[PDB]
Design a protein around this ligand. Sequence first.
Ligand code: HEM
Ligand SMILES: [Ca+2]
Ligand SMILES: [Cl-]
Ligand SMILES: [O-]
Ligand SMILES: [O-]
Length: 445
Amino acid sequence: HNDKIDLDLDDIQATVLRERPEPYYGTHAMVRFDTAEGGRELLKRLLPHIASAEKWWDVKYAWTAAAISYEGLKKLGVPQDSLDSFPESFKVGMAGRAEHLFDVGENDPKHWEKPFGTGQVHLALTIFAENEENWQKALVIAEHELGATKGVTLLMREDFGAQPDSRNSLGYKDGISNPAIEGSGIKPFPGQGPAIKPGEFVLGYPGEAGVPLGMPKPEVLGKNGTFVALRKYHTNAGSFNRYLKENAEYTGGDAELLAAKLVGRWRSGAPLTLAPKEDDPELGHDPNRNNDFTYKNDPEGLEVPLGSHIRRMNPRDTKLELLTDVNIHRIIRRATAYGPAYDPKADSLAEDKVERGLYFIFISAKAMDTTEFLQKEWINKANFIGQGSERDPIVGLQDEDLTFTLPKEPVRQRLRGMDTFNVLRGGEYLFMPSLSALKWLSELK
Ligand code: HEM
Ligand SMILES: [Ca+2]
Ligand SMILES: [Cl-]
Ligand SMILES: [O-]
Ligand SMILES: [O-]
């Protein structure tokens, strides 16, 4: 490590601190506890296989993450006093909080894929791996322990990764910008700072306001845990490709530059702030360069539009309406693309029905609050950036009359006619407990 360690890394789950591998392979599995006894036995069987964040900066070929819903803790027999100490948003669950998320219309929970939104997801298991061999080793273990456990049911399994050049379902490099955590042991990459106080991401530690956020009780249940918003999206890549072709007239006929303007980065990962006129793939793949900007040199969005995805999600130095503290609205993202590789040349309606997309694991000590805030305030409206009702082009709920403001000299351009290019298929609010908490849960009576 190269910075003072303040976190109990040996007790925090690996996924809280470990970056997604590149390349990456893995599996998401949703599990229901049919009995309390089955859920506890499953956790006991899995605990030796759930790695901590010890030396999270080092190479690790695979790890297995575990996160538990409100209905899963209830079913395990967590006492009512403990259940009551969780946030109300978590207890209600993601679908129940649809109004706070603007999960309406195409994203309404009524239309979600089973098992999401029904209370049946109790445990989400995620295997992350850097190579196929170690992915399969961890998968064999997890499936063996699941099969061996009476009283649990595998609801759904979906494999992810294996994408060409690790690109996501719209062909973008991702996993680039995540918060640095003061006390993790590792100094920020250039532009990744400022390091955020640890309590914003790990319960039991002081946050930006100097005190620990509210946490579950007793201490062995809440300390060194965190919250997760898990969201699965389907990607409509045919409609996205057709949109780029039909609106590239607004970016000199260059469809890849329009792709860069909508997200804020070229698909290579190069941010427009550091590559405003042509792509720079080498820069895009280099973590010591690809995040080293703050928008101070782009107050008007002539490089990165103020309503582009990344500038919405992390405004950095942008002048917003109302002096907002961005440090308390950060989120750790583990993004996992799934399904057939993105095809940049496929623009048919049938291409939209290819089963590809992304899962996100959004991690924070207040993941419910921050996911709701981002969804309601920075994705599905634009008051903070002074562009009215415009919604995020990549994950906002679109209709054809909503616009995307593309700053240009001498006059701005407003594109329109977007679809919702990434549609929510389901999600859950989950608790990612410490290793000590997992042991405690498995030993409830
Ligand atoms: C669902 C489809 C989505 C796609 C295809 C997508 C794609 C991307 C891409 C390409 C990047 C830039 C590379 C990187 O920094 O990793 C990015 C960044 C980011 N996205 Fe998304 N994203 C999606 C949804 C979301 C949602 C729902 C949220 C939060 C509620 C979100 C939050 C962020 C954040 C915080 C960043 C980093 C911004 C920064 O620090 O500069 N994304 N996303
Ligand atoms: Ca359409
Ligand atoms: Cl990551
Ligand atoms: O992403
Ligand atoms: O993202």
